[PDB]
Amino acid sequence: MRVVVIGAGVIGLSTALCIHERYHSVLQPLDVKVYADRFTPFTTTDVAAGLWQPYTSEPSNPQEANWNQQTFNYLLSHIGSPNAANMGLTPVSGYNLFREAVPDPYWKDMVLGFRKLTPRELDMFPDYRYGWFNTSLILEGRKYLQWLTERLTERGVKFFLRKVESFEEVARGGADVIINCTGVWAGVLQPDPLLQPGRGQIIKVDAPWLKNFIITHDLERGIYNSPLIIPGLQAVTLGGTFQVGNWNEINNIQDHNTIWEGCCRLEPTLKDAKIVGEYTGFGPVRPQVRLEREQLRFGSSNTEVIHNYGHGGYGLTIHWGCALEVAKLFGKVLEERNLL
Amino acid sequence: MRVVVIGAGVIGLSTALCIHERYHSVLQPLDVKVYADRFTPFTTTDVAAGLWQPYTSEPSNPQEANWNQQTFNYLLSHIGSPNAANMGLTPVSGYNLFREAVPDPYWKDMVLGFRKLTPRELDMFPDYRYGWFNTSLILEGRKYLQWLTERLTERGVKFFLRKVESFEEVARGGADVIINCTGVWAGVLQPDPLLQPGRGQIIKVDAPWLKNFIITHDLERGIYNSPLIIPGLQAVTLGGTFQVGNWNEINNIQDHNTIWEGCCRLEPTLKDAKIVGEYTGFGPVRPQVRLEREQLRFGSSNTEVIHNYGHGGYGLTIHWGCALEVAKLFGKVLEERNLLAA
Ligand SMILES: Cc1cc2nc3c(=O)[nH]c(=O)nc-3n(C[C@H](O)[C@H](O)[C@H](O)COP(=O)(O)OP(=O)(O)OC[C@H]3O[C@@H](n4cnc5c(N)ncnc54)[C@H](O)[C@@H]3O)c2cc1C
Ligand SMILES: Cc1cc2nc3c(=O)[nH]c(=O)nc-3n(C[C@H](O)[C@H](O)[C@H](O)COP(=O)(O)OP(=O)(O)OC[C@H]3O[C@@H](n4cnc5c(N)ncnc54)[C@H](O)[C@@H]3O)c2cc1C
Numbered sequence: 120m121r122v123v124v125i126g127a128g129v130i131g132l133s134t135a136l137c138i139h140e141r142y143h144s145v146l147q148p149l150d151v152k153v154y155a156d157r158f159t160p161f162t163t164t165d166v167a168a169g170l171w172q173p174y175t176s177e178p179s180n181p182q183e184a185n186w187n188q189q190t191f192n193y194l195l196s197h198i199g200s201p202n203a204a205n206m207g208l209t210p211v212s213g214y215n216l217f218r219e220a221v222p223d224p225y226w227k228d229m230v231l232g233f234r235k236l237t238p239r240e241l242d243m244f245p246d247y248r249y250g251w252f253n254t255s256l257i258l259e260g261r262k263y264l265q266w267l268t269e270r271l272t273e274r275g276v277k278f279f280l281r282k283v284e285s286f287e288e289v290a291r292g293g294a295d296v297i298i299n300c301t302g303v304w305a306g307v308l309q310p311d312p313l314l315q316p317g318r319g320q321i322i323k324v325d326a327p328w329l330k331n332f333i334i335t336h337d338l339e340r341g342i343y344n345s346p347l348i349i350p351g352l353q354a355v356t357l358g359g360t361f362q363v364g365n366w367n368e369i370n371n372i373q374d375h376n377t378i379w380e381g382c383c384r385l386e387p388t389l390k391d392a393k394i395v396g397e398y399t400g401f402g403p404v405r406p407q408v409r410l411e412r413e414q415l416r417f418g419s420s421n422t423e424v425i426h427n428y429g430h431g432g433y434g435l436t437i438h439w440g441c442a443l444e445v446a447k448l449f450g451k452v453l454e455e456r457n458l459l
Numbered sequence: 460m461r462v463v464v465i466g467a468g469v470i471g472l473s474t475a476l477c478i479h480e481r482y483h484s485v486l487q488p489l490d491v492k493v494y495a496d497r498f499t500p501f502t503t504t505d506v507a508a509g510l511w512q513p514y515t516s517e518p519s520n521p522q523e524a525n526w527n528q529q530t531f532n533y534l535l536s537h538i539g540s541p542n543a544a545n546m547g548l549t550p551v552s553g554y555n556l557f558r559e560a561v562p563d564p565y566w567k568d569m570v571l572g573f574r575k576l577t578p579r580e581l582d583m584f585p586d587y588r589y590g591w592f593n594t595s596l597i598l599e600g601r602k603y604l605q606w607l608t609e610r611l612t613e614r615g616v617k618f619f620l621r622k623v624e625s626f627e628e629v630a631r632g633g634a635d636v637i638i639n640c641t642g643v644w645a646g647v648l649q650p651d652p653l654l655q656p657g658r659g660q661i662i663k664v665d666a667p668w669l670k671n672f673i674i675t676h677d678l679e680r681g682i683y684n685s686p687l688i689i690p691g692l693q694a695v696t697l698g699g700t701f702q703v704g705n706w707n708e709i710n711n712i713q714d715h716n717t718i719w720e721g722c723c724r725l726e727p728t729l730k731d732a733k734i735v736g737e738y739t740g741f742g743p744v745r746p747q748v749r750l751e752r753e754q755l756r757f758g759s760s761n762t763e764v765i766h767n768y769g770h771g772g773y774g775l776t777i778h779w780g781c782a783l784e785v786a787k788l789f790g791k792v793l794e795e796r797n798l799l800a801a
Contacts, residue, residue, distance in 0.1 A: 198583045202728075204666075212552040387539070
């Protein structure tokens with residue numbers, strides 16, 4: 120049985136590994152290949168802030184909260200392992216800062232040690248009047264992608280740098296199942312007017328003194344359009360823009376300024392931080408993750424397509440629950456072909 | 460008047476700056492000098508792990524508790540300032556790990572967000588069954604010493620290479636007041652058998668992924684003779700020996716192995732960490748800090764000495780309270796000569 124995963128971002132590769140690890144031992148034969156037109160370090164994943172944290176507001180689909188939880192438990196469970204850091208993973212603690220009282224987030228018990236900030240803590244941050252403290256996990260996009268491609272490759276899964284033009288051509292090339300993990304460009308293969316770019320720009324900086332995440336919110340401007348600081352494994356990510364609808368892949372001058380001045384004010388030690396790079400990427404914004412089976416019909420036979428895209432600004436955060444769910448749906452497909 | 464501070468470790472330079480800041484505007488002249496035979500990076504201070512945290516048990520002198528507290532609030536008050544990191548100062552969070560239930564430390568409300576660990580947190584650290592979480596402050600010895608010498612120099616305080624042989628020497632050189640901040644070597648200038656070396660060996664390592672401090676305790680083997688991991692501003696300190704009475708300044712292989720393997724066991728990601736140096740230093744261990752005024756007579760001059768030494772394995776943690784207290788006692792020396800403050 121031939122499976123082509125399209126996409127080598129976090130979603131693509133996580134899914135490929137989950138399918139393979141789940142079915143290799145039982146389905147003979149099983150051929151899994153990954154096709155993508157960019158690999159690390161050239162994916163949106165590579166440019167992610169690298170923090171586990173859902174949006175502040177509850178999810179529409181209740182399945183999404185479960186997926187986020189299963190992802191946290193999965194990642195956390197690696198912590199005492201020798202390889203957690205080679206995977207891109209380490210524990211970090213930090214602050215969410217608000218100008219007024221807000222409700223507790225749905226994820227308060229998923230993270231470790233959630234509590235509200237005290238007045239002394241708040242004086243660390245003069246511009247803000249309310250917030251949270253918790254411990255979470257760094258998951259570095261770049262490093263995680265290199266870990267997964269290594270695990271996948273060791274297991275015989277083969278990668279092809281190529282651009283896919285249609286589902287039809289891949290089916291015709293002999294795929295029995297296609298997993299569509301094309302991120303924000305999924306519309307090219309099948310129009311989807313709910314799918315939009317979430318344009319985020321970031322500044323990467325050497326400031327290794329900073330050991331905590333610091334996330335501000337502006338209620339009247341929408342999520343991640345206010346200053347955020349996230350220490351990564353070797354560098355710090357500085358953020359504060361997230362505009363849906365903008366397809367500009369180039370770094371913008373006002374966003375640079377929004378980010379630098381917002382963050383220099385949040386964290387004035389940044390004055391001595393060396394700029395390492397500045398980047399722009401597109402989160403696959405969609406009111407709901409598209410994670411569903413579709414049957415396609417070209418010549419003899421159906422080829423089965425399973426979509427997994429539209430994870431917005433939380434793909435690192437949610438990725439493993441989604442991979443598990445795709446692997447289940449793939450189980451159902453096998454069953455319907457009496458492959459077990 | 461003429462003040463000679465002996466010592467350029469954290470205690471020496473803290474105290475010098477605190478005196479100068481408090482009394483610059485009320486005395487004329489005020490001639491403050493620092494004499495030391497080692498300066499950064501060659502003091503014990505430079506080799507400290509760089510964390511704010513007192514001993515787990517209450518101190519003999521309860522004054523020490525306020526001194527630690529004042530130090531925290533002082534340091535904390537710099538967070539949100541543009542220069543906090545140039546001073547060696549940044550917030551950090553972390554874990555204290557125990558093999559059995561222990562009482563809360565007296566300093567639990569001084570730190571930020573003290574709580575007990577939950578079972579999932581405890582799963583991160585297999586060999587341990589109980590402990591704490593809190594946020595505290597890194598104060599890097601090396602950087603803080605550099606910041607202070609800069610601040611002190613800007614203010615007209617003068618530094619001299621000088622191995623002092625007696626208090627008499629310095630009095631007769633014309634010091635009116637001597638502040639004795641000589642750390643573990645204070646016994647040289649005035650015997651003090653309550654003062655002993657606390658030999659600590661450490662390994663410095665590049666492992667910038669580590670964001671939290673991690674301190675284990677072994678109630679039976681005494682304090683800091685259990686693995687400890689403390690991220691610094693750009694490298695990580697790996698520890699686990701603290702042996703009183705040992706004057707051996709050279710690194711030994713047995714403590715190396717105790718530290719490496721203990722810490723690899725605590726934090727197995729350390730397998731990929733690059734070793735970047737290994738050091739030994741001597742905490743000035745004393746049942747309590749010696750912080751007191753003494754009058755010495757040489758010819759018919761009275762000289763005032765104020766001691767500030769014996770801060771053991773917590774000099775960074777306590778230093779500012781002790782400097783403030785020395786400044787107090789200096790006020791009283793002034794007052795006794797009909798000189799006026801505020
Ligand atoms: C600035 C920024 C910061 C972020 N920070 C975080 C964070 O801190 N935490 C978090 O959880 N999430 C974060 N996100 C969201 C996260 O980055 C995305 O949800 C995630 O990277 C999307 O993963 P993906 O694999 O779906 O898409 P991508 O990583 O973009 O992967 C898409 C893949 O599909 C391939 N592809 C597409 N079409 C074709 C085709 N036709 N032929 C061949 N190959 C194709 C591409 O080459 C690529 O391999 C952030 C996003 C941005 C922009
Ligand atoms: C391995 C290790 C880790 C530690 N970690 C921590 C920690 O994480 N947190 C913490 O709070 N504390 C820690 N400590 C304790 C801390 O290092 C000490 O309490 C502190 O550095 C002592 O400061 P000091 O200025 O008294 O002495 P020092 O730093 O030793 O300075 C002594 C000064 O006196 C000078 N001097 C002495 N005699 C003479 C003389 N005759 N003439 C001229 N000059 C003289 C020396 O040259 C030097 O300038 C640690 C100690 C060790 C050994």
